[PDB]
Amino acid sequence: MLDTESRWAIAESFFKTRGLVRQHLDSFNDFLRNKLQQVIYEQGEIVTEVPGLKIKLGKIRYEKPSIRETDKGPMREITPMEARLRNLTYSSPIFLSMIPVENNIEGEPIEIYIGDLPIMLKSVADPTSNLPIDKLIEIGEDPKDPGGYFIVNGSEKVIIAQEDLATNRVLVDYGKSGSNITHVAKVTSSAAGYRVQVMIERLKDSTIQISFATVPGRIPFAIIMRALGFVTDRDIVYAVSLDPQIQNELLPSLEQASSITSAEEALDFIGNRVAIGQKRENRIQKAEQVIDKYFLPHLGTSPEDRKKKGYYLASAVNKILELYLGRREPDDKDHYANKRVRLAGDLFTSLFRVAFKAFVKDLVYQLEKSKVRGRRLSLTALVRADIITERIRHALATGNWVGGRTGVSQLLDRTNWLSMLSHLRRVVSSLARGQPNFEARDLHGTQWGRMCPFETPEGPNSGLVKNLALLAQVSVGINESVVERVAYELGVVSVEDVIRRISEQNEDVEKYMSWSKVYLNGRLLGYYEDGKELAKKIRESRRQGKLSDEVNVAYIATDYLNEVHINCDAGRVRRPLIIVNNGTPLVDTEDIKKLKNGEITFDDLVKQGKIEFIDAEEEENAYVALNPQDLTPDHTHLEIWPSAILGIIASIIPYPEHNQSPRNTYQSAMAKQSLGLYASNYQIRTDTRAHLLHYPQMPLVQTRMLGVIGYNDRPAGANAILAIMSYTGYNMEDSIIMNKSSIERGMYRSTFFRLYSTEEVKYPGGQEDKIITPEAGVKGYKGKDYYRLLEDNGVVSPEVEVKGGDVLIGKVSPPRAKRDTSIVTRHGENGIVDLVLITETLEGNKLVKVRVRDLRIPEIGDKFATRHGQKGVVGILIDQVDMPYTAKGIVPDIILNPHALPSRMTIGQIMEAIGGKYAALSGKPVDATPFLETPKLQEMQKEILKLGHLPDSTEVVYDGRTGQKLKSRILFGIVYYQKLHHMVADKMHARARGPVQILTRQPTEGRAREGGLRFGEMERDCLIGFGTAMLIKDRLLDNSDKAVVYICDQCGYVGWYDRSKNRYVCPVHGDKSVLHPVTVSYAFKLLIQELMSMVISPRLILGEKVNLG
């Protein structure tokens, strides 16, 4: 029998063999091995309008990452740390083998340099992926870094997985109520560069219309069928289905095209739809080319592929008719069988395809222009490779991907270990924030084991941004041809063969109406006798290694449906399960014995047909058991790890099954923000913002996954003696009380690091150059005392006390009369200069980086949290003398109000307190993994009693101020706490007076811009509700954009008052009118002026200030 230890051994072997970022690495490796060559085979060869001149492409390859610096010669290999320090890009050159034919002359193969491709860390192309720990340490690398990102311009960028509906599949649904359309079907064909949507309607009058983007309006179904080669109506009604009931519905659509009985009539009907006012010939060729290119490109873009498109359309029409007759239900659209996850590999292959198309277009244009001008054939002289390197890099550094995607590439969140780990496993839904729909944010039952039910954001993105589960695995896909061949040789019969047997041979259709339809990637493949037998055969052949493991098969049987679905494409999220045969799992005692001593690994069990990865579609035929002790002969699979339904951050909560649901989501959100050690080499890498906890501690109450992910080596908190009591009222309403004496001993102290950088631009456009020197006499000088910290080279030296707006790096800029452009410390924050770095940015330009550190000591207003969703600020700090000591002299480190517990219902908090106290007393390990907690509470309480303390974890407490013994006992524990980066020292901002806008003459915006608070409409409404007129005037007029303007007494426009001698002058009346001054908001005067910019003429009518009577 499989106990807890054996299942944990299986899971630990899984985590040890393949890491936590296997999805990114697998997708990138697949793209690098296959998808790179496939793009240039798809290109094939470039043609030229000039006959006899063309190029044939060959192989493509990549080398080790390297750079080409000033005085370019041989390329020099670099390490990722050097790329980080020098603001380079960790990329490798790519070489392409090309052969030029000039009037059918071969010549010789040429291998050229076509650009640089970024390399993901720890991938197959990264030389540091197969290095020992000693060599990783030697080159300045963190041995525990799970590299799944890119170094672009020194920054670390990660490609977020994008979840979206499957493309080459038919989705059916009901039409909107009160409309002529009753049922709708949609397909989204994906080509090698473009995506085309085809929509099929079923109108009120029992007609079927097909309309896609290119051709305006709707086209009847029989018209498209005739245009694709189906001339006889019997051919159409037999390609749709063999059911007489379904065939009866085709009659209105069949007769609506009775006028058109030939392919050419349909073709020029489509031409008239697309081409207006042209002859028949060009119309028909335009129509046939648009049909062959923009109808269903995934099936093919060749004029002999029309039969496949016709059969696909017939199958889609059959599906919509089945929906109409009531034999189906509208598709879920949230079932994970209908969703695919695009990863870095697919995005990179699309981006590289686009960039290669642009590069080859430019190359052919330049080649033909040069040949028109007249020159010899030298490929290396006109490649202009810098296109490719520019196109890919700009995609990674901005996140604006091809196809309209935005935000795909994001900066890695290195706040701590958990932030980076959670970022490397995020999944973002594409169709989001356009409408709630109250159903895409639901917790679908298909997500079990694939997405974490807790780690989701709060707000507009709730339920749309998800995180992968522990054992989830994204499929990579194989080629459909081998699956099609094995399916055909298994015994299925093509639809054409079945139609022939039905029609040209006197065989009844009743025989084939009892057969099972067989699909492949959403496309109808054929007919089979018994679908269940075929599914069993495919499953058995897959487990024996004869068939690829990427193939998943399901069998669907209903009162009206009998189908077999086969999927072998990429983007499907699958999970592993142990195969159960006759009520006994295929993993036995010998297997776990061999697993516990390293003889076999997790991958060995998978390739032996004992553990299989199944997806959502196949799981419809599964009957899984949670534990080995409730297995039955009807069960098919067994869960490897019941606690593996959680994410990577929800796996750190102790006793998560005793808390309320929202608390775990809040815990995940806050744990993504705690302070602590984020990297071992943090002292040599340059990040814009960094935090460091001085004395981190690993939790006393652990979980099984804390040691696997390496959190015990990069902890982000400390253990605090927590008391649960009401004390002084300073911990009411989410606030907490902290010991000041323990703070003065350095409990939660931290350091904050900020970075400043500068570069000496060479300005090749005019040959002037920058220089980093002090600013004795310069145009934009600041002050003599400000530049007092700079050295003789114009750079401040380490270990000096900077303050306010002191100059760190001093450089001057040539006029575009030298101007002082020096980097100054940000206003309102000071520190000590920590590090100064000087290097060159691959072109001889001098790059200077200055890192400044400052010390953060906890105070009133700092934010702390737990692993159970208990955030709050410090209300007050109490010394050790004033704290309520117990009978042994132990004072609490943090006091927590009891009134916060009964409403939030976090029993795990008290359970963790008791467990931590037991762990500290006994010295024994405590495991708080959900559903498998050891030791139990009763054992821990008995051991606590045996060790000299009360079993209920309560203590006798005396008052530290008066010495009087409290009448009750107080609960003490060792709960683990975390400090968040929301410190009060970065949130204050006040403004009295200062700079104003140049346009509206109103106070500026921003903490660094001396401040300014916005007085919105709702505050004005509160002031009106109180009925305070003078307070409104003071808040809204006297303290912002007040001005005095002169208005003419006749026209009503604004005049002025010049200093020539003395005059009230009007723009139109000159000196023949009297002008009066009025105080007014300057924004109103701006509004008047910009209204006169348009043809509107606003005339102000004045009135007497003093009310007569």
Instruction: Give binding residues as ranges.
Output: 1048, 1051, 1066, 1069
> 3-state SS of 397-418?
CCCECHHHCECCEEECCCCCHH
User: What x-and-dash track marks residues 977-1016 binding other proteins by CB under 8 A?
Assistant: ----------------------------------------
Q: How far is the CB of 681 from other proteins (least distance, A)?
A: 4
Contact partners, residue 890, CB within 8 Å, separation at least 6 = 721, 955, 972
**Cis amide bond preceding 220, omega within 30:** no
Contact partners, residue 781, CB within 8 Å, separation at least 6 = 775, 820
Alpha-carbon distance of 450 to 569, in angstroms, equals 18
- Count, residues near Zn ion per rule CB under 5 A: 7
Place of tokens 């009206």: 560
Q: Is 745 in the site for other proteins (CB under 8 A)?
A: yes
Q: Is 250 in the site for Zn ion (CB under 5 A)?
A: no
Q: How far is the CB of 741 from other proteins (least distance, A)?
A: 8
Q: Between 344-373 and 386-396, two packed helices, what is the crossing angle to 10 degrees?
A: 150
Question: Among the candidate windows 105-113, 200-208, 371-379, 1066-1074, which touches Zn ion by CB under 5 A?
Answer: 1066-1074
Q: Is 436 in the site for other proteins (CB under 8 A)?
A: yes
Contact partners, residue 885, CB within 8 Å, separation at least 6 = 891, 957, 958, 960
Residues 658-717 that bind other proteins (CB under 8 A): 658-662, 665, 677, 680-684, 694-700, 712-713, 715
Give the residue with the Cβ less far from Zn ion, 112 or 1068: 1068
Q: Which of 260, 524, 640, 1048 binds Zn ion (CB under 5 A)?
A: 1048
Give the residue with the Cβ less far from Zn ion, 1001 or 1069: 1069
Interacting partner of 605 out of Zn ion, other proteins, none (Cβ under 5 to 8 A depending on kind) = none
Question: Among the candidate windows 95-103, 559-567, 652-660, 993-1001, which touches other proteins by CB under 8 A?
Answer: 652-660
Q: Is 1069 in the site for Zn ion (CB under 5 A)?
A: yes
Contact 149, 157 (CB under 8 A): yes
Residues 620-639 that bind other proteins (CB under 8 A): 622-626, 634
* Nearest alpha carbon to residue 691 among 680, 671, 677, 681: 677
For residue 187 the two structure tokens come to 């397909």
Question: Among the candidate windows 117-125, 335-343, 457-465, 863-871, which touches other proteins by CB under 8 A?
Answer: 457-465
Give the residue with the Cβ less far from other proteins, 243 or 620: 620
State yes or no: is 734 an active-site residue. Answer: yes
User: What x-and-dash track marks residues 82-101 binding other proteins by CB under 8 A?
Assistant: x--xx---------------
Residue of minimal Cβ distance to Zn ion: 1048
Q: Is 1017 in the site for other proteins (CB under 8 A)?
A: yes
Q: Which of 170, 919, 980, 983 binds other proteins (CB under 8 A)?
A: 919
Q: How far is the CB of 333 from Zn ion (least distance, A)?
A: 59
Q: Is 20 in the site for Zn ion (CB under 5 A)?
A: no
Give the residue with the Cβ less far from other proteins, 65 or 892: 892
Q: Which of 118, 146, 453, 884 binds other proteins (CB under 8 A)?
A: 453
Residues 512-551 that bind Zn ion (CB under 5 A): none
Q: How far is the CB of 1080 from other proteins (least distance, A)?
A: 26
* Sign of the torsion formed by the C-alpha atoms of 556, 557, 558 and 562: positive
Give the residue with the Cβ less far from Zn ion, 680 or 880: 880
Q: Is 957 in the site for other proteins (CB under 8 A)?
A: no
Give the residue with the Cβ less far from Zn ion, 56 or 1069: 1069
Contact 851, 685 (CB under 8 A): no
Residue 904 belongs to what H/E stretch?
helix 901-904
Residue 1025 DSSP SS3: helix
User: What phi and psi values does residue 581 have, to the nearest 5 degrees?
Assistant: -120, 120
Residue 232 burial by CB count (10 A; 0-12/13-18/19+): exposed, middle or buried?
A: exposed
Q: Is 462 in the site for other proteins (CB under 8 A)?
A: yes
Interacting partner of 82 out of other proteins, Zn ion, none (Cβ under 5 to 8 A depending on kind) = other proteins
Alpha-carbon distance of 896 to 912, in angstroms, equals 14
Task: Give the pairing type, strands 161-165 and 155-159.
Answer: unpaired
Q: Is 647 in the site for other proteins (CB under 8 A)?
A: no
Residues 774-813 that bind other proteins (CB under 8 A): 791-793, 795, 797-800
Q: How far is the CB of 914 from other proteins (least distance, A)?
A: 12
Interacting partner of 579 out of other proteins, Zn ion, none (Cβ under 5 to 8 A depending on kind) = none
Q: Is 1047 in the site for Zn ion (CB under 5 A)?
A: no
User: What phi and psi values does residue 60 have, to the nearest 5 degrees?
Assistant: -130, 145
Residue 1014 burial by CB count (10 A; 0-12/13-18/19+): exposed, middle or buried?
A: exposed
Of residues 497, 713, 734, 1034, which has the active-site annotation?
734
Alpha-carbon distance of 542 to 564, in angstroms, equals 16
Contact partners, residue 957, CB within 8 Å, separation at least 6 = 723, 725, 884, 885, 886, 887, 965, 966, 969, 970
Residues 875-894 that bind other proteins (CB under 8 A): 880, 888-893
Q: Is 441 in the site for Zn ion (CB under 5 A)?
A: no
Q: Write the DSSP string, 311-366.
A: HHHHHHHHHHHHHHHTSS----SSSGGGEEEE-HHHHHHHHHHHHHHHHHHHHHHH
Q: Which of 643, 651, 667, 909 binds other proteins (CB under 8 A)?
A: 643
Contact 853, 832 (CB under 8 A): yes
Q: Is 1066 in the site for Zn ion (CB under 5 A)?
A: yes
Alpha-carbon distance of 16 to 21, in angstroms, equals 12
- Greatest Cα pair distance in the chain: 115
Active site residues: 734
Binding site for Zn ion (CB under 5 A): 1048, 1050-1051, 1066, 1068-1069, 1073
